[PDB]
Design an enzyme around this catalytic site. Structure first.
Site, short mmCIF file in Angstrom:
data_model
loop_
_atom_site.label_atom_id
_atom_site.label_comp_id
_atom_site.label_asym_id
_atom_site.label_seq_id
_atom_site.Cartn_x
_atom_site.Cartn_y
_atom_site.Cartn_z
N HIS A 256 14.41 -10.32 62.86
CA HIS A 256 14.43 -8.94 62.41
C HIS A 256 14.73 -7.78 63.35
O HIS A 256 14.73 -6.63 62.92
CB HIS A 256 13.10 -8.67 61.72
N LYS B 27 20.07 -18.70 55.27
CA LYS B 27 18.86 -17.99 54.91
C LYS B 27 19.33 -17.01 53.84
O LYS B 27 20.24 -16.22 54.07
CB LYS B 27 18.30 -17.24 56.12
N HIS C 287 5.82 -10.90 60.50
CA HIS C 287 6.53 -11.05 59.23
C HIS C 287 7.09 -9.72 58.76
O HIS C 287 6.48 -8.68 58.97
CB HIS C 287 5.61 -11.58 58.13
N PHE C 288 8.26 -9.76 58.13
CA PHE C 288 8.85 -8.55 57.57
C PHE C 288 8.57 -8.67 56.08
O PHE C 288 9.10 -9.56 55.41
CB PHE C 288 10.36 -8.48 57.84
N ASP C 289 7.72 -7.79 55.56
CA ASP C 289 7.35 -7.86 54.15
C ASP C 289 8.31 -7.17 53.20
O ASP C 289 8.65 -7.71 52.15
CB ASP C 289 5.94 -7.30 53.96
#
EC number: 4.6.1.18
Length: 124
Positions: free
Chosen positions: A12, A41, A119-121
């Protein structure tokens, strides 16, 4: 094994540019960040701000994560980001991505010591 924090950085973070240069940005970045090695991905967001600015979000607005966990934080300011998503013509080993640049708030899940993004939410 790659640490959670390191995986977040690889997937990210892209502080080398202020915003997605062209429509081929995602095809290039998804490949270079090794997100098309054994499979494409489907979705991946890259943030165009300094690592320090993204890490700082872990001390900003605490909000719920989509999965219900309470270790998510939403950036106070908007940030330059690029969403990369597979197109219909995408099929391993020939991955194809649509590049969508935007300036919005990011929401990340944080954990550990140091308390950093893992984590990228989502983006808002």
């Amino acid at each position: 094994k790659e640490t959670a924090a390191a995986k977040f950085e690889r997937q990210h973070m892209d502080s080398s540019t202020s915003a997605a240069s062209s429509s081929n940005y995602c095809n290039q970045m998804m490949k270079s960040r090794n997100l098309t090695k054994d499979r494409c991905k489907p979705v991946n967001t890259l943030v165009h701000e300094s690592l320090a600015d993204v890490q700082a979000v872990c001390s900003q607005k605490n909000v719920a994560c989509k999965n219900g966990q309470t270790n998510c934080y939403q950036s106070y300011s908007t940030m330059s980001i690029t969403d990369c998503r597979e197109t219909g013509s995408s099929k391993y080993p020939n991955c194809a991505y649509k590049t969508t640049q935007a300036n919005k708030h990011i929401i990340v899940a944080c954990e550990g010591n140091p308390y950093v993004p893992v984590h990228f939410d989502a983006s808002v």
